[PDB]
Every structure is written in C-alpha cells, then in structure tokens.
Amino acid sequence: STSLYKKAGFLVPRGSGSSQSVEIPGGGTEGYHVLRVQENSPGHRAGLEPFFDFIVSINGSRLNKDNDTLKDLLKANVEKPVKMLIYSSKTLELREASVTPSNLWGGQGLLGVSIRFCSFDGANENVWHVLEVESNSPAALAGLRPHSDYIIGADTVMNESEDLFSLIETHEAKPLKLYVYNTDTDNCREVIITPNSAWGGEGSLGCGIGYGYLHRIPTRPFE
Amino acid sequence: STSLYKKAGFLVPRGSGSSQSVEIPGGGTEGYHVLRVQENSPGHRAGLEPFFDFIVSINGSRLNKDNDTLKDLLKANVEKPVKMLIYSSKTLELREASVTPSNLWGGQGLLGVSIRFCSFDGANENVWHVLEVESNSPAALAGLRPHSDYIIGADTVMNESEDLFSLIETHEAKPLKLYVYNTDTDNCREVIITPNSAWGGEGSLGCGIGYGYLHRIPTRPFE
Amino acid sequence: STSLYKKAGFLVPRGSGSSQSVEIPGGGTEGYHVLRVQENSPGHRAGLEPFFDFIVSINGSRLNKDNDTLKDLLKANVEKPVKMLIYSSKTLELREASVTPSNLWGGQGLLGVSIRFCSFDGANENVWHVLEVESNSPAALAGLRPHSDYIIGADTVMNESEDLFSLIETHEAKPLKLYVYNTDTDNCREVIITPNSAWGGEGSLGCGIGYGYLHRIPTRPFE
Amino acid sequence: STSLYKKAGFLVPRGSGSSQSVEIPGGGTEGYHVLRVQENSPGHRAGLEPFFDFIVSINGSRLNKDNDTLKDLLKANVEKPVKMLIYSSKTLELREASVTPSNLWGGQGLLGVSIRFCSFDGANENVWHVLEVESNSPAALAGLRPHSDYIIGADTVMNESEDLFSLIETHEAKPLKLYVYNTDTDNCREVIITPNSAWGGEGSLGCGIGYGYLHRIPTRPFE
Amino acid sequence: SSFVI
Amino acid sequence: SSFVI
Amino acid sequence: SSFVI
Amino acid sequence: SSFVI
C-alpha cells in the first residue's frame, strides 16, 4: 500500500502474550511472586528464581490466597522438607521443588525469600528498565543504577496502578519503595526513592525508562 | 566507596533541566504549543517549528491565555502580516517572526497550524518514543510506527496526567487521540488508538516505549 | 534443549533489506548518492532528499559511471530545466524531478548538492547511529552529537571496506573524515575526526554506536 | 555557531574505561581471562566470575605467559588447595581464592573452567550487545539470542584485531566461532556462526549490535 | 484540546 | 505488600 | 571522494 | 585458542 512499513519475523522470549494459563492444578491464575532470595537460604537451595518463579502450591494445597496459609504451613513444618509447586514465567512450566524451612540458616525468615501475592499472567511484560541515571538525581541517591537495574514494582494500595509512572507523581515528597531486579546479582531488592520534579534535572527521578521487548529481563537460550 | 559506579560527563541537549525561564516579556511561563504545521501554510512560511516552537505574543500582546484572543487577532488581520513572538524549547531563545494569516492558501485555518495551550517549562522531556511495534497491534492499526514516531501528548481533561501510561488504562475500549511527532516528516499528527490489553500481545498498545535522554526528539548541533 | 525463544511479527521499514526489486532503466545498481543539499538551492527546490535519493539518470542519459557526464549535461543546460530520474532508498521507487541548474544561485555548484557515486542496493542498512557522547571525547570535538547523528560513510585515501571500526584503527592518529546525517537538519555534513584510543575514555571515539533496525534513519509512515 | 549541546554528569560503571590503576604484583597487564565456569565445578565453588575475573597468579607464581605453568601447578596439587590471585574487571581489585583441583569432579578439566590468555586493561569495553535477531537469520541458527547475549570475542586461525565487523567480512562464508556472554546464565559459551550477506535480511548476521555505555555487561550496585 | 489556526 | 518468608 | 554539482 | 583447566 502507501505504508512505508512491512512485516518481518524476529526472535522473542517464550514468556510473552501467548497466554494461555496451561494449566494450574487448582485452577487459579494467582500465586506468590518470588522476589528476593537471600543467599544460603532454604529458598536458594531449592532453586527458587527471583522475579521468574511463582509459588503455586505447598504440599498439594493451592494458594489462591494472600492469607496466612503459606506462613502457617511453613511454621508447622519448621525443619522438615515441604514440597512446593512452582510456576516459571520464563519457561511457562510447572516444577516441583523440595524446600526445608528453617531457623538455623543465618538469614531472616524460614525460607529467606521475599514474596508478593499477584498474578503471573503477563508479569514478564510489566518491567521498567532503568536507563541513564543523572548524578545527584533522586534515582542515584536512592540506589538505582543505569542499565543493570529493572524496576518491577512498588508497594501499592488502595486499588490503583499496574503501571509505574502513576506512582511517581503521587509521592512528590512522600518516600516511595520500589522492587528492583539487578541483572548482575540476578536478584530483587528494595529501593527507597524520593520523587522530586524540582530536583534540577530530567523528570522526577532523574533517570530514563525503557519498556517492552527491548527492555525485558534477559532470558537464557535454553530450558 | 563500595559503589561500583562513578561519574562521567556526557553531551546533552541545551533543552534540559537548567530551567530557567529567561525571560518572557509579559512574565508568564505558558503559551501556545506549535504542533502540526501544514505545508504551504502561513505558519510554514514564518518558519514555525512543530513541537519546538511556542507562540508567546502577537503584535506585542502576551498570551497568558487559552482564550479566543489569538483567534480574534488573526481574524482581524486576516490578510495582513502580524508579528509573533516565538519561544523555542530547542534554543531556549525568543525570536520575532512575521506571519500573514490567510484564507487564500490551499489548506485549513488562517495559519495552518495546530496548537495547544500549555507550559513550555520542561516540555522537551515529556516525550514518549515509540520503539518496536508488533504486527496487528493497536499501535500498528492506529498508524504508530517504530522508532520514527514520538508520542508527545493526548486530549486530556478533567485535571489528570502529564504522563502517558495513565491514559492507556482509562481508554480500555474508549478510543484515544495521540499527538505524534515523526522525525522524518519533522511534524506532528493525530493518531487514533484503541487500547486493548487483551489484543493478544505485548502491553495494551503492542509497542515499546522509551523515555529520557536516549529517547528525545533529535536536535541539530548548532543554533 | 528447548528454546526459550519463539517468533513474532514486527513492523520494519520497506527498505529492509530493500529486498529485492531493482527495476532500473539502464540496468545498473549504481548511481549518484545525494548527500548534502544546500538551502534555497536548485536541488532543494527540486525536492532532492539527502541520503535517501539517488540520481540514476539525467535527461534520459544513464549514470552508470563515475565520470563528468552529469556535471557536463547540467553545464550545457545552465539556466534551463533538466529532467532527472531519481531512486529513493526510502520508497524503493523511481520518480522524475525537474531541476534548473544556475550560475546565479550563487552558492557552490549548479545545483548546490553534494554527491557520491555508489550503489543503492541495501544502503539503508549501512548506517551507524551515534549514541552517547563523552565530554572532551574525539567525537565531541569533531562535532558528532548524541542520538541525532548517524554516520553513513567516509572518505578513504587508502582503501578499505569503509566499515567504521575497520577505519578507526587504521586512523589511530591520522584524522578521518566522516559523512554524518542529522535527523533534525535532515541533511548530511562532513565530520573530520581524530581517533585516539589513548584519550581519557571509552574506545577511540568516546561515543556509543548502534546498528540495525533499532538504529536506522527514521522514515515517515506514508509514501 | 552556538552549540545546542552542553555537559551533564551521569553514572558509569567503575571499570570505565577502567581508568587507570594496574597495581599488579609481577608487573604485567595480562593474565588468564575466565570464560566459561562449569556448574558444581571447583572453579564455581571458588567463586570465579565468567568474563569479569582474570587469573593473574597461582601459589605466588605470576602468569605473564601463555604456557603450561598454570595447568602443571594444578596438576601437581591435584587434590589439594591452591591459592589463586584474581583480578576483577568489575571491581578493578585483587583477591585471593582457594581452589581445589580434582580428577573426581569428573567433568572436563581439573577446575572446569574455560580460559584464554589476554590483557584485562579495558576489557569491559570490548563487548558487543546483540540487539534484535531476525528469524532464520545466521545469528538465530547459530544460537545467538536478542538482548540477553553479549559477544565478547572470537577464535581466529588467521590474524586480525578480533574486531567483530572486521571478521564478519573475512568469514563471508567460512564459519566463525564467537565467545558469547548471557546475562541470565552469567556464563560464557561458544557460538559457531556462518556470516552470509546474501541471506534474506539485514547485514550478514541478521541481528542488531549495540556498543558502549548503553550496551555493557551489567554490574551490581556494590562491591 | 488541540485546535487548528 | 511484600514480606519475607 | 564527494563533489558538489 | 581457549582451553579448559
């Protein structure tokens, strides 16, 4: 036609919009999003992968939940192996992992895993890539680092966003917490940021943001 | 320190957060944002630059405004030259241009310029770069094109956003209008987009978004 | 080994990889690459587009060889209209433009157009996008600017594949001349750069480089 | 001619351009570049980091030359602890690691580490970020994946500056071997690619390439 | 909103 | 919100 | 290599 | 050019 554009095929990660929720024992679409995994933790030993793994079931019990079931089941099996059903937003697959909650490892908690109850449906898209970072910018002082860091969420209520920017204006002085994935550590951490549109530079954070296929958390070539 | 990062100097466009509103005759910070400039228009002949130019004054009259003054002053001088004061977000400078509104050119309106009343303070940052675009995506069907297109705004009320995403969810079926700058045409145009998070692909638009110094509207090396 | 990647359709520019219909009267694949087009020039008035346009024929005479025919035919029609056949690497199409050479213009040349003889087959790929630029870097001092500049070729007294990196080492102190397209000026200009790997920073130029579909010279949505 | 550009401070990785303190015991600048580190290997247990770590000394013996000393010293201490001096292009610092070579591991090698002898001075720059990848492209079939893969070097039977583009033309049908780092696996692997400029798409590999600060291997915020 | 002039 | 387990 | 016309 | 140890 008159269009100066046409179509071409490109390689994209499997973790994309071909979803598909095939198929969750228990039927749900929600679970516990594995965020930070402390080192030498039970969660680490079980091979739990930050951002990519979702805890779907423990000892056969489905977690359509955000309650205290998981917490209580871990506490009741406090030094025994418990079987977990894990969903990967990377492989789009379910796998069984053995994990032994414990107080005897040197960290915090029984698994040493920071989690959040959310849906894994299209979670691999909802990523904000930190691009350039100005000196003395809010992002810099908060701990955000260029290109290595990926913003994957915040602490949010009442019913609000799935999208990042809709928070930056809300906390125009009120401090803000961010869930940040780093591609070197392959792990999540919390970042305290103080949005300031008057900080004397770019935007309210002083950093660039990438969204989309060019700005996703990297994936290995093979399962 | 323990930081694995340090600081380095880089080249950035003058049009950045060193603002500074030096200095508007009349004192304001707002004016008429020059969007689309039709070809063979009076606005084109006057050298009005899409996105970068702001109309600040006509025949000495300051436009702290969003009313019918400009419209009426153009209509009263309907085939005479009128003097305009223009502010450039590119050069951060004021210049005088002669422009002759007319009905005798072959386009629409007396200047052939689409405008919007807004503030020019930090307008060079508020740009959303269209990155990759999926086939049959809402962005594709709306007319959005990869890398060449820059989203610079929408039609918005009641008091709401300056940021783009906070609209994509609002119009989850309701059609949406976007102001898009294309780096080949060096011009603005309106794009009708139908956000659909269930379109079977990435996000609600099916395109990537870049924001920041790596994703700004390009600037020539010299004034 | 199951791949964690799959295929998806995306929008790409028509001239990518210009694949493949030559349809050229005269039979060749080579012509005169339109580089810089001076302002208020006969060439500007004729609508010649820098980088994208190729002069393939004048008054019916095919330009298969880097000789003085084109210069001489313009000189013989020195204040009369001449018909040129133009090929666009943007539209992949042929069009005729009327142009009137002149001695009265009185800038440099009869048309005010800088050209070079090369092939148009896949010329839209041979582009290097200048990304970030360090302060006091060779790129900075030579005049190269971040994101706005695109390196589209060079002059070689010696002989190489013109490939960018394959020249930077050859000219490890010896100055190098580059042809640079700027997406704001929509024009080409010459940049003399002095590659220095011992300069206080990254690489030999002190700038980033992008290559590919994410780093092409932008194209308007329609023909 | 007033420049429309100015200078601003931004965050960059410490090893950029690693500038410049060598502080090396033994005096050299060269060592053994740690490439692939096998899983559950002695090298893995010793904490050797692929691409970033350089083995400079073993048991006090400096490794200034590409010989069999390192192999032989490991072989003489075949089930005993060995002290290695390690240089990191990430931290620009030296550390000692204890490693116990073994025949019982029983993967390939005594440590299970792929290495190559080169200089660590400015090795964090010599990286090519694989961007987009076309379907059925040479890059696709060789195994290269978009955004996750980083090309960090190659093997040459002939002799060149190893520079990427300066090899792709040399190997215009002849296969080429590449060393590729993946930010998910945090490991190196070998990719045999067959450059073909006559393949149905962009360039000879069918992929995009990024170079510079926007395209470096990611680094954690802290040492 | 935007409007032509 | 997030919490450690 | 370039020249003006 | 690479070799395992």
Numbering used by the authors:
A (entry chain A), B (entry chain A), C (entry chain B), D (entry chain B): -14 to 208
E (entry chain C), F (entry chain C), G (entry chain D), H (entry chain D): 306 to 310
Q: How do the authors describe this structure?
A:
GRASP55 is a medial/trans Golgi molecule that is involved in Golgi stacking, Golgi fragmentation during mitosis and the unconventional protein transport triggered by cellular stress. The cargo receptor function of GRASP55 was attributed to the interaction of GRASP55 PDZ domains with motifs in the C-terminal part of cargos such as CD8, TGF-α, or CD83. Members of the Junctional Adhesion Molecular family exhibit a similar structure with two extracellular immunoglobulin domains, a single transmembrane region and a C-terminal PSD-95/Discs Large/ZO-1 (PDZ)-binding motif. We demonstrated that GRASP55 interacted with the PDZ-binding motif of JAM-C in testis.
Therefore, we co-crystallized GRASP55 PDZ domains with peptides corresponding to the C-terminal 19-mer of mouse JAM-B (JAM-B_P19) and JAM-C (JAM-C_P19). The bound structures of GRASP55 with an uncleaved 6xHis-Tag crystallized in the I4122 space group and contained 2 molecules in the asymmetric unit. Notably, GRASP55/JAM-C and GRASP55/JAM-B structures exhibited an unexpected ‘closed’ conformation that was characterized by a 33 degree rotation angle of PDZ2 towards the PDZ1 domain and a 12.1 Å root mean square deviation (rmsd) after superimposition of PDZ1 domains to the previously reported structure of the ‘ligand-free’ GRASP55 PDZ domains. The overlay of our structures with the published ‘ligand free’ form of GRASP55 reveals that the conformational changes occur in the main chain of the second PDZ domain (PDZ2) and its relative orientation to PDZ1, which compacts the PDZ2 into a ‘closed/cargo-bound’ conformation. The cargo bound conformation may be preferentially selected in the presence of C-terminal JAM peptides. These structures indicate that JAM-B_P19 and JAM-C_P19 bind to a groove on the PDZ1 surface, and C-terminal residues penetrate the conventional hydrophobic cavity found in this PDZ domain. Most of the observed interactions occurred via the last four residues of JAM-B_P19 or JAM-C_P19, where the carboxylate group of Ile0 is coordinated by a network of hydrogen bonds to the main chain amide groups in the “carboxylate binding loop” of GRASP55 PDZ1. Residues at positions 0 and -2 are inserted in an extended conformation and present supplementary hydrogen bonds with the 5th β-strand, which adds a 6th antiparallel β-strand to the conventional structure of the interface. Several supplementary intramolecular hydrogen bonds involving the Arg101 residue from the PDZ1 and Ala139 from the PDZ2 of GRASP55 were identified and contributed to the conformational exchange between free and bound conformations. Measurement of the relative binding of GRASP55 to JAM family members using homogenous time-resolved fluorescence (HTRF) or isothermal titration calorimetry (ITC) revealed five- to seven-fold higher affinity interactions of GRASP55 with JAM-B and JAM-C (4.9 μM and 3.7 μM, respectively) as compared to JAM-A (27 μM).
